Amino acid sequence: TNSHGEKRCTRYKLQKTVRERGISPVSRAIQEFEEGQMVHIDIDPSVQKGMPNPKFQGSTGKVIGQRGRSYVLEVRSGNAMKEVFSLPQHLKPQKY
Amino acid sequence: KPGSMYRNVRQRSFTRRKYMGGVPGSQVIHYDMGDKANTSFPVKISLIVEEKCQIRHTALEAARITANRHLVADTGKMGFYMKLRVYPHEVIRENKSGMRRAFGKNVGTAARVKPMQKIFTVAVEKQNFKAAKEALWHAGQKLPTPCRIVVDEGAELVQ
Amino acid sequence: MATGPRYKVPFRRRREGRTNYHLRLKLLLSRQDRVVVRKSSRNVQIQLIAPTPDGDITYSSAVSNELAKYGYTGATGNTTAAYLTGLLFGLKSLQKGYEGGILDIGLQASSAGSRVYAALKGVVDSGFEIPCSPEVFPPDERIRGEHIAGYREESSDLPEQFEATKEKIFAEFS
Amino acid sequence: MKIPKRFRTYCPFCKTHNEVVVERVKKGQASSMTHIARQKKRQEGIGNSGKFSKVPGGDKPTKRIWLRYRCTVCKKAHQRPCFRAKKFEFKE
Amino acid sequence: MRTPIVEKVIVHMGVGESGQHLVNAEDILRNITGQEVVRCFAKRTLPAFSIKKNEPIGCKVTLRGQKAQEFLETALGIVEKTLNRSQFDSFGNVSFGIEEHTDFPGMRYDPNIGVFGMDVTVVLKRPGERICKRRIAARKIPAGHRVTVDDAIAFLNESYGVEVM
RNA sequence: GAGUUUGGCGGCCAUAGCGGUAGGGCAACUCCUGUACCCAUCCCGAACACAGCAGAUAAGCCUGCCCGCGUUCCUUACUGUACUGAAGUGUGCGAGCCUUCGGGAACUCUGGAUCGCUGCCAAGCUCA
């Protein structure tokens, strides 16, 4: 039977491209975010700590608070609001 | 087991042989026939299929045998070059009880070919064009698809 | 040798062997200015750096070429010159409005009584705040330049000129 | 596996790190004056006794290695959620 | 600044086992080298030697500077200044073999120890090859700056007088 | 007030890599020189560390060049092809496929470009 683990069916959700494999840009890991700012969840597979679910990969979260290094995001999953803790390595700002 | 069983293409490609078990290999022996060195054949024709069909390896071997024998008896042993382009990569599995645990065992391979995809390419001289064309006609009678011949090289050389 | 399209070239600083990015990620998590001390074979240089996504920016700096104007004549690439450069950097950064920062020796190896730790002791003695352990500090006679008697008698001008430069720079910035 | 007989860890009572001696916990004999023994004596009569006629169940493939970490300073031992192992020995 | 100067001298003793023999090997290597000598560990176990993984097999020493120059002069003396082109590497780093440590004067043969042959190799580089070894901004040396085999034999003839044929 | 060079820290992480040729250093950098000391070798002052007068731009480095390999981009053709969103009293014995409106490749090909761009600070010089 199939499993129910957190990494289930994440062969390409949590995979890095060939020319971004290895160390990531360190400037992405100290990008400070403001209160209420909209940020995109684009999970960095190399950074194995503070990662959200693969189910939130590609969702825009509204920053509502900080819990140390990571940020608190109000993410939408279908019809429910979720609080998704993610470090700045996995987040990316939305530009207008 | 007639070819009508494993003919229609309604299933995905079952070719990754490291995740299956014990495929009986194809009976197809060769894929190049005739002069495998003379690249200077002016008139070149190809047998193309005009449906989406799965050709069994036994069908491919029978077609190759009839076409090669006709070409050897028509244009001599070294007066032609005939190429079977497609390898049988798909593995054909039969549910050898009832429908419980229906994923069958591999009972042979086959080649999945698209419409207008060339099966046999034949290169011949000017005078041996008709014999090569007629042998390719006999080759497609052993295949499960409607087949039409198309001329690759020397369209002006014939008419 | 980028043999094909599946070749991952290192980053440009890593290709040039000039920056470690794992150490850079470790240091940038502090959210504090870095005391980027770099030593050259003929003199020493110290910077205060704060990163922004456009690139690093440097607030204050100080090299061994500035020690001439304060009355220094000896070698600019020894422990004494490193200490004087660190003290000048600390006083100048205090004057500009910076008093904190974590040490950053980068790719340079860590060993007690080096020129980098001499510059660190110079920065600490100027009032600039930087977390450090006194084990890696050099002895006071080494900062004075008490090596002189081994090889050369023309090195004997070092300690008096070091003390003179120290008092001059302290009067200059305070 | 192996765990040292003595190693320095955290004593939650003295609230400091100290050398602790590890001792295997001994499953004690069941007391005959507990409330369940009195209830079992009170439920014995003619016929089935319910939970006291049950034969106790089997065992897991590997039991946990039940260990106690007695502090060497204040002597107060504590015990923590222990690993599960087949063969256990003490390194000295 | 193109002279292929002697970067280092390498000496190795392929004992092939350990016990008393390897200790005697490292002791005599230290005696004839004038420098502390380290051993070597087998990478995998092979029943033909009957060796085991992570088991000491041989001993090696790295010689530099005037010690390297004097030891290489002694090795050239034992070889009688004779060497052929096949010894040289593709980049001029030579390596040859000797079969008797008693060829070295100053050391007395012992009946227990026997005769030992040690493989010596000296690497020849150019003044500026430190860039590929340092820790600050290490870069690869190009093809032009490297040392050719003919330049190596020319250097060995001019500095050591070893004719290579 | 501005510019060139040099150094440190970088951002984007190959348009930046791999490879080949031609030029330069006053200041700088490097190579390079020793081992009293600080520090160090699973041995070697090789690296690190320290103290540096020389000598050398031969390499690091900088400038220009070469389409050769890789990458990226445009370009003509393949081609509005493949594939596909919607609808269809359109069609095939069947596996299926067609028309309309709306999107739209990849490979290859033609002719070309790309042998990095840029941010901060400091040292110098040359400002009008």
Place this chain on the structure above:
RNA sequence: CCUGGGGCGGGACGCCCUUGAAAAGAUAUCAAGGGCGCGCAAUGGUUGACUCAAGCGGGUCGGAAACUCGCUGAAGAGUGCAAGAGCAUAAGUCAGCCUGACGUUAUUCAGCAUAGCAGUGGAUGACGAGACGAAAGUCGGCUCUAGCGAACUUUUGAGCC
């Protein structure tokens, strides 16, 4: 109990990974590939120093089988074990020092999308103690995802009612 009727066979009866699955999420079958019910005081933590697999070249019966030197080498190795993902001045290897394989405690995830649901984990934190380190940091075991179990009962640990 499931079950292309039931039975025989099997466990698709608990947990984990790839495809199926139609490029958000979800998605069944006795669907396909399978694995787990463990091992480890180091096969763990941290700092420093290095880089691996495999080729070509040189070295003496040390053979085309050992060990050693140079060159190519973004990984073709290793990381305990399924599968997938991660990693190169390293998440690998070696060595120094250590025991964070620490006591207590709060949230949100995901088992269980949407959308209730057990004991459990797994990511952020907090209080108190440390280890290594110049410091930044890292350490709540072994790179991430399996290795396990309610109520009742008994035993044990510290102090109390």
Place this chain on the structure above:
RNA sequence: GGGGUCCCUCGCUCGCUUGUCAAACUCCAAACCCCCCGUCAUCCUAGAAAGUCGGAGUCCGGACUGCUGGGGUA
């Protein structure tokens, strides 16, 4: 490495040019689709989104058009 002075036969192995593939392959890569922002549109104080409570039924479904859906000779 295989065969009738290891004289020479010679299959694998490595490059240039061809011929085919993948559901557990990807240097590439759509159209749908999903999160967020702006705009228009529609709903909305005659009550948006949210919340609390009362009442259930329901967990035998089936079909048409697509996904070459999976399995199957069908």
